Amino acid sequence: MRIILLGAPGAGKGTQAQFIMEKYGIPQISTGDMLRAAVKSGSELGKQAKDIMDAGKLVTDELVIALVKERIAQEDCRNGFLLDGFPRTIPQADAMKEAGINVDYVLEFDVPDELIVDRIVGRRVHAPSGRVYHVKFNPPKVEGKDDVTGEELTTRKDDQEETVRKRLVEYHQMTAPLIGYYSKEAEAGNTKYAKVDGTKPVAEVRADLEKILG
Numbered sequence: 001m002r003i004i005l006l007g008a009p010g011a012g013k014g015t016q017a018q019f020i021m022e023k024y025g026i027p028q029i030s031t032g033d034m035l036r037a038a039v040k041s042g043s044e045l046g047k048q049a050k051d052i053m054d055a056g057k058l059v060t061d062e063l064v065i066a067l068v069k070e071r072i073a074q075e076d077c078r079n080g081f082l083l084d085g086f087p088r089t090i091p092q093a094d095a096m097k098e099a100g101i102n103v104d105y106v107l108e109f110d111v112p113d114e115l116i117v118d119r120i121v122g123r124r125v126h127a128p129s130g131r132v133y134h135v136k137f138n139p140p141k142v143e144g145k146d147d148v149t150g151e152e153l154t155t156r157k158d159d160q161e162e163t164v165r166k167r168l169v170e171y172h173q174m175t176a177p178l179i180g181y182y183s184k185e186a187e188a189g190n191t192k193y194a195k196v197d198g199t200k201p202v203a204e205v206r207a208d209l210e211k212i213l214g
Ligand SMILES: Nc1ncnc2c1ncn2[C@@H]1O[C@H](COP(=O)(O)OP(=O)(O)OP(=O)(O)OP(=O)(O)OP(=O)(O)OC[C@H]2O[C@@H](n3cnc4c(N)ncnc43)[C@H](O)[C@@H]2O)[C@@H](O)[C@H]1O
Pocket: 007, 008, 009, 010, 011, 012, 013, 014, 015, 016, 031, 032, 033, 035, 052, 053, 056, 057, 058, 059, 060, 061, 064, 084, 085, 086, 087, 088, 089, 092, 119, 120, 122, 123, 124, 132, 133, 134, 135, 137, 138, 167, 198, 199, 200, 201, 202, 203, 205
């Protein structure tokens, strides 16, 4: 099963990607996670994103498509994968087309723009795993620590109010067009498209998703 998650910054994509992964055994390929990791390792493919992500901007398509093709080539992806954060632009969606990567489901997480900045200021992450928490909406079982490893949670560098605003504008300009792109793909019979209400509580969003996927 191959799934794309689509949605504005902070719509809950990464939070739901951990449930789909654990419940359906398909790997989560998250380009934000792969790029923060590359920046942190000084990996030649991806360390270049450091300043772009800091500014709230999209990294070049050519770079991100290279990372994703590499990852899909690892033996875990031969039986499905979940794309979280990719495609992010119409060139990245076309590249998937050209390459024979068709998906089963595209899920749009809809959230109003006005909720995004407070979701993101309460966000705390366990960086090694990419697990994400919210101090109010979805807190860890022990404050400040990841549930699994007991390691201290941190804040992302690009999760301040002005970088989020910048990210919202780039989302509306470049990424929002993918809703029409893939809705056209669903019309043609090439994928299934399902929209979910990302304002519902985390567990409730989790339950709508089980109705769509099995
Ligand atoms: N393909 C690509 N092309 C080019 N550049 C690329 C690229 N991919 C990445 N990049 C780059 O990397 C940068 C950042 O990219 P990004 O891909 O956005 O990495 P991100 O910040 O980790 O995640 P998102 O902004 O997408 O939020 P999300 O929808 O996953 O929601 P989450 O579950 O955390 O939820 C948010 C918060 O709210 C919470 N929450 C979740 N669900 C709910 C709910 N139902 N109710 C209430 N609160 C909730 C969470 O606990 C959390 O605290 C970009 O600016 C760009 O530079």
